[PDB]
Design a protein around this ligand. Structure first.
Ligand code: G9V
Length: 135
């Protein structure tokens, strides 16, 4: 449990201190309200925003950077689909993605260790669950 909690706390700090700090990133902070953007959900089948990512982190959805990056990269993919690649929204989404990748890279050593520990704790719990299943 301790490694997963630490990993989640680190991901949350990247979201609030780096990604939400990107200038003009406010349109990405919360889910789109269709009352302001009427056809958003007709175009975007897999919506994503920074609040949803923080909610996912609170629930410990991410065990590795790969699953975290899958949701982060959706923010950029959704913007290119809805706004076009040339849009100022897309430029902001790219800057949110950039600061995320750059921050994760600066934490590479410690995040690799936490990911290995999360995986080790998971595998050990599953082996124990299988052995005790006949009790
Ligand atoms: C999360 C990813 C979506 C990014 N995004 C956002 C908006 C956008 C969303 C909202 C909105 O619904 N809000 C505000 C934030 O709090 C919740 C309610 C309001 C907006 C907006 N643009 C101008 N206003 C006044 C927009 C418009 C055209 N393309 C986009 C676009 O790609």
């Amino acid at each position: 449990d301790d490694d997963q909690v630490a990993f989640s706390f680190i991901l949350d700090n990247i979201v609030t201190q780096k990604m939400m700090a990107v200038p003009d990133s406010w349109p990405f902070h919360h889910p789109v309200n269709k009352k302001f953007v009427p056809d958003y959900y007709k175009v975007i089948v897999n919506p994503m925003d920074l609040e949803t990512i923080r909610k996912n982190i609170s629930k410990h959805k991410y065990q590795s950077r790969e699953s975290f990056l899958d949701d982060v990269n959706l923010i950029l993919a959704n913007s290119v689909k809805y706004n076009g690649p040339e849009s100022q929204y897309t430029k902001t989404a790219q800057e949110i993605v950039n600061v995320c990748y750059q921050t994760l890279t600066e934490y590479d050593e410690h995040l690799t260790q936490l990911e290995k520990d999360i995986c080790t704790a998971k595998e050990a719990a599953l082996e124990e669950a299988e052995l005790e299943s006949l009790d």
